[PDB]
């Protein structure tokens, strides 16, 4: 009926740094391989809306959309959803951060459903997002650990 991704990775760095790096929207084009532009459009206290524009994808297509994001550092969680859904009927995001031995575990969850007629169906988009998410989490893990190394 619906689609979902659930990926985790442990970053060998303190919560504060992991949280500050991953929630720095302006740095997303450097953190995420697929994002060319990331701009915070507006903010209503608790949350904010921001625009994302991708680099050309595996098929030479550039995508662009607006999303609503609500970070809650106190609860070490982030909630977000696409306002402009594109090929998705809907797309929700949920990130959690949990302290573990030696670092911080990040768990990213995506919940969505493809619009009938989309170029990709639930099963295939799920596989695609799992691949890109895992690669991004690994890359971000490295970037954060680089920064952590430089601080000490
Ligand atoms: O190359 C792509 C791709 C793919 O090759 C296989 C697949 O199964 C799904 C896909 O979907 C990607 C995508 C499109 C619009 C978006 O808003 C988004 O977040 C991701 C796309 O770039």
UniProtKB/Swiss-Prot annotation:
Keywords: Antibiotic biosynthesis, Methyltransferase, Multifunctional enzyme, S-adenosyl-L-methionine, Transferase
Superkingdom, taxonomy of origin: Bacteria
Region called Polyketide cyclase, residue ranges: 11-140
Disruption-associated phenotype: In the absence of TcmN, the linear polyketide intermediate formed by the minimal PKS consisting of the TcmJKLM proteins undergoes spontaneous cyclization to form some TCM F2 as well as SEK15 and many other aberrant shunt products.
Coverage span on the entire protein: 1 to 152 of 494
Phenotype when changing residue 35 to A: Abolishes the production of the first ring
Similarity comment: In the C-terminal section; belongs to the class I-like SAM-binding methyltransferase superfamily. Cation-independent O-methyltransferase family.
Function: Involved in the biosynthesis of tetracenomycin C (TCM C). Part of a type II polyketide synthase (PKS) that catalyzes the synthesis of tetracenomycin F2 (TCM F2), a precursor of TCM C, from malonyl-CoA. The TcmN N-terminal domain, when coupled with the other components of the PKS, catalyzes the cyclization and aromatization of the linear polyketide intermediate. Catalyzes the cyclization of the first and second rings. In addition, the C-terminal domain acts as a methyltransferase.
Annotated consequence of substituting residue 108 to A/L: Strong decrease in the production of the first ring
Protein name: Tetracenomycin biosynthesis bifunctional cyclase/O-methyl transferase TcmN
């Amino acid at each position: 009926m619906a689609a979902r991704t659930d990926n985790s990775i442990v970053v060998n760095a303190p919560f504060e740094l992991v949280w500050d790096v991953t929630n720095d929207i302006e740095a997303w084009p450097e953190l995420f391989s697929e994002y060319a532009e990331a701009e915070i459009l507006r903010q209503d206290g608790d949350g904010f809306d921001f625009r994302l524009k991708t680099r050309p994808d595996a098929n030479g297509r550039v995508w662009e959309w607006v999303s609503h994001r609500v970070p809650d550092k106190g609860s070490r969680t982030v909630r977000a959803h696409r306002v402009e859904t594109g090929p998705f009927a809907y797309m929700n995001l949920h990130w959690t951060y949990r302290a573990v031995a030696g670092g911080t575990e990040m768990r990213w969850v995506q919940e969505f459903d493809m619009k009938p007629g989309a170029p990709f169906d639930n099963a295939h988009m799920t596989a695609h997002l799992n691949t890109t998410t895992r690669a991004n989490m690994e890359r971000i893990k490295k970037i954060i650990e680089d920064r952590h190394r430089e601080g000490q």
